[PDB]
Amino acid sequence: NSKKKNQPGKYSQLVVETIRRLGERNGSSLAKIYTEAKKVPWFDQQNGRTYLKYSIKALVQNDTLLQVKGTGANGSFKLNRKKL
């Protein structure tokens, strides 16, 4: 209601598309998504880890994605919503 949806960025979409792709039973990690997200040809190496860090911070706040536990450094996130 009164909302006009965003269009999440090219890195913010990778978080969703990699977390759905190799969807762990519990908590897909920033380091794992980083490990294989960087095989993508358009990914820029020096900074892209920072962009997946920016993405998940917002993506968790959006009720788009949800994180289960801490582990190493609050680094385990599952895609919250599958619609009813």
Binding site for DNA (CB under 7 A): 25-26, 35-36, 38-39
Distances 4 to 7, 11, 31, 59, 74 between C-alpha atoms, Å: 10, 21, 32, 17, 30
Shortest approach of DNA to residue 13 CB, angstroms? 20
Phi/psi of residue 54, nearest 5 degrees: -60, -40
- Between 4 and 25, CB nearer to DNA: 25
Shortest approach of DNA to residue 24 CB, angstroms? 8
Shortest approach of DNA to residue 7 CB, angstroms? 28
